[PDB]
Amino acid sequence: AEKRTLIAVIADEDTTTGLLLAGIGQITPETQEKNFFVYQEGKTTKEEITDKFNHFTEERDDIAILLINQHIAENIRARVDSFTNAFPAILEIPSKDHPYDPEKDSVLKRVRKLF
Amino acid sequence: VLRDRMKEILSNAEELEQVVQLVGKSALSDSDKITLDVATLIKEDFLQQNGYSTYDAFCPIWKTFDMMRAFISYHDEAQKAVANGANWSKLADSTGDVKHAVSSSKFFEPSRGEKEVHGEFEKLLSTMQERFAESTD
Amino acid sequence: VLRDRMKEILSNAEELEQVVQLVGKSALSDSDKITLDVATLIKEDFLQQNGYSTYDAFCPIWKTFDMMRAFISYHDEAQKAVANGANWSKLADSTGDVKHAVSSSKFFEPSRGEKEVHGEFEKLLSTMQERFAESTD
Amino acid sequence: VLRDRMKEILSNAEELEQVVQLVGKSALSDSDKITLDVATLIKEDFLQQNGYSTYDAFCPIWKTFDMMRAFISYHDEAQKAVANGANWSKLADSTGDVKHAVSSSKFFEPSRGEKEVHGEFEKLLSTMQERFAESTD
Amino acid sequence: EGMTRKDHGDVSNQLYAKYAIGKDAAAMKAVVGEEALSIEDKLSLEFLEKFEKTFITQGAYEDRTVFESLDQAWSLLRIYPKEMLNRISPKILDEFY
Amino acid sequence: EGMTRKDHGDVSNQLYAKYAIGKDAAAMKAVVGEEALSIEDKLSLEFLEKFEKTFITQGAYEDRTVFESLDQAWSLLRIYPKEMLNRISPKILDEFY
Amino acid sequence: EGMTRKDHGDVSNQLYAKYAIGKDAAAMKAVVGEEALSIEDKLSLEFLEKFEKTFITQGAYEDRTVFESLDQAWSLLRIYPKEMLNRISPKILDEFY
Amino acid sequence: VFPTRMTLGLMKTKLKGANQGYSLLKRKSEALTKRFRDITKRIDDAKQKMGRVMQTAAFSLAEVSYATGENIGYQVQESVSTARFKVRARQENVSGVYLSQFESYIDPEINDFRLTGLGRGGQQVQRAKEIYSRAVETLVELASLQTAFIILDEVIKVTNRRVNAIEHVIIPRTENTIAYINSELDELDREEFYRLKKVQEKKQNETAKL
């Protein structure tokens, strides 16, 4: 039952802002920290994504779905794959400026061996 | 040569089915799919009998030799054809007449090419070569 | 009519017992849970026998029928609720009071209701019906 | 003390192993692996003592004490290490050469060190304590 | 009465039943996994360990009185609440719980 | 054949097969439920029940002739369509269904 | 010596001990699946496969020399680090893995 | 080791247990694997669907940002501190396993901000916002299958382990035990008769003799 209500994001600027207009993530008022992480490609470090991921999965116990741009999941690949829980669900979506590759998607990788 | 290959095909067929359960179809492809299919045709032609015909109960040494020759020739050429670009369903539909005619060799007379020699098998080899051209292209 | 249904509940229980061990409890439907649950009531009250003669270990045959009547009247209601919609858990909360009574049947004596059966058991059949109507709605 | 513990460590190891085999190791703590891991070192190092030399065939009371003392000490320290932070794999990987250093002590003669206690076992205690700090880190 | 309690028969009955379930559950843990197990079974696993290491562990020269032995039996039994204990008549249960 | 119809041997193949599948399917129902149970097995689950309760349950002094017995058989198989009674000839099946 | 190595017996002890371990690791592969297996089992899995088709497969009119078998053993046995190869002494081991 | 007399009744039932277990858990497995395949295909398609619709709306917002002047998106992120689309989680039993599912509810806390109105530049953000809300809501509903899919992913691995574990370790152990004690047990009944018979012959011979 209910224990998770937010949908969070790790995505590039135009992708993140748009998700917010649609009305899915928010910033907590008590901690002063976002439940989205903005990213810009080549410009913002691989390390910061890795922390923010930990903030969202393990320190937030209220994130229901963690959405993540495929290009971005590919930078911190170990971190996305190694988390096998559905709590949060990890949903890799094709990153802006890139098509759908079925093997930049962590759940599908796992699916292939043993049906 | 032909007998050893008979044993191998049955052993393999069994083994690829287990993989389809545990591993999945991701370990399955069309080369394997032809392997399952040759074993099915071998079971029906060899293993199943009950004396429906008189020619289904006496089949000479030379006739038995001729049935296994069709099926192994189908196998190797189907695999070659899917590698130069073809699909299982496409191979299956295309082989068709020959595939039907060779299954039905048990109902057919064994005195067709003399008295022990069956003519249909001798004419299969040539059909198979022209057929392989239809399946690839 | 009662005797055949008591065995029946217990039969299904053995089948259930193997699934319960292996898979767990997290897979059985609402109907199946009840079967085990009414089975508990019979195991508690009939198979156990408290004392030499203390705790009213002596049950006359007519009292025994009444003990059984209370459980199977409960089973049929219990089977209808889940089927007409009511979670196993919800149905257990709502049954409450009538369930405790049937559980408590063995300490009671029939010599203070009539002389061989209990006025308390007659009252129990009315209470069952009333409970059921509230709980279903 | 060491004999009490010697019994316990092998008996706990056996029960755990049944669950790893059947269910898996992936449904079971890092800690339960640790008991098995230390237990294994005792299995090769003690049990095989058939020897290929007099050095690997003889084991005085002092030497027998020493090899047991280093393994129990490893267990106690390893469970701490993982518990305050440190994965399993990292601990296994780190101790590495040390696991081997005790393994090889049997091959070397006991007339070495002070008496019948190797300088290699004497040093081995310091190396153990030095290792727990790094594993933990 | 006067040297043993009236609860004494009841007390033995409780220990067997829990001790038995605990054993049965430990076996299923082994083959299939902890998907078969339930919360009740956890109480039971926990109950096996408390029984073995407290009740059955004692001296070779450490003698006891019967009253003490029934008092220690009780200690183990405190972990199930009243509603899951039904190997004692409820009348007796309210006194000694 | 003369006092028993020709369909006896054929019908026995179908009743036996379904009955087998039917035992297995009930065990499966218990676990999976009916939200992911197979369709072929769902009809076989209901089939297990009728096979017992009418073809195997009879009176004390209830007597049934062989012709009659054969008819009842087809009635139990009548629920399945033709595509799940595929081990029988369309001529016989089209007459007897 | 002079026809056998003294190492000949020692080499046998690695070969037998690994074969067994390997055989156990294959038993776990069948059950648990590779993903679940740890690093130690994977090496050993690999050793077992190589052992069957190369060591115990030879011709039926094909002779072997004892020297020759041990040299074949060393390559096959070479699939483990020095920590794990410890059923032979560090002197002989340092030379040949 | 194994019991001297009559393990056989027990071992018979052990044999039965093992064998039923393998069948049922392979059926449970069979249903999970069958459902999973179908869900895998839905998901591959859906990922392309979500990506294309999300990006079309992405491109519309990006043009808008540039035309309006300045990087609008930083401003919007701070200002927003509540969410419309949340989920309330529910358990659904599919194939005897309990999964987590998500059901969206749309809260009307926010619908217009203070950045979707600016005047002329504001009318552009507004046209963008509307494509993004429609596109995203669909994406949230599709995302619901994912959560369940991941739990399915986990459960198939466990369930497969078990079918194989009953098969290899338990059943042949049970064969080996049952045979050894059956043969011992039979040996007792036959040797007993043989010893008694051999002695009788002597006793009979003596009486005839004297």
Secondary-structure map:
This is part of a larger assembly, with one copy of chain A (115 residues), three copies of chain B (137 residues), three copies of chain E (97 residues) and one copy of chain H (210 residues).
Chain A: E1 6-12, H1 13-21, E2 36-39, H2 46-59, E3 63-69, H3 70-75, H4 77-82, E4 89-93, H5 106-112
Parallel strand pairs in A: 1-2, 1-3, 3-4
Chain B: H1 2-22, H2 30-47, H3 61-83, H4 88-103, H5 119-136
Chain H: H1 8-68, H2 73-79, E1 85-94, E2 97-106, H3 120-209
Helix pairs in contact in H: 1-3
Family (chains E, F, G): Belongs to the ATPase alpha/beta chains family.
Organism (chains E, F, G): Saccharomyces cerevisiae (strain ATCC 204508 / S288c) (Baker's yeast)
Subcellular location (chains E, F, G): Vacuole membrane
Task: Kindly describe this structure.
Chains B, C, D: This is V-type proton ATPase catalytic subunit A. Chains B, C, D: Belongs to the ATPase alpha/beta chains family. This is part of a larger assembly, with one copy of chain A (115 residues), three copies of chain B (137 residues), three copies of chain E (97 residues) and one copy of chain H (210 residues). Chain B has 137 residues and is mainly alpha-helical. Helices cover 70% and strands 0% of the residues of chain B. Chain B has helices spanning 2-22, 30-47, 61-83, 88-103, 119-136. In chain B, helix 1 (2-22) crosses helix 3. By secondary structure, chain E is an all-alpha fold. Chain E has four helices and no strands. In chain E, helix 1 (8-31) crosses helix 2 and helix 1 packs across helix 3. The radius of gyration of chain E is 15 Å and the shape is flat. Chain E starts with 7 loop residues before the first helix and ends with a helix. Chain H is mostly helical and 210 residues long. Chain H has one domain (5-207): Helix Hairpins (Orthogonal Bundle). In chain H, 75% of the residues lie in helices and 10% in strands. In chain H, helix 1 runs antiparallel to helix 3. The interface between A and H is large, with 50 and 62 residues.
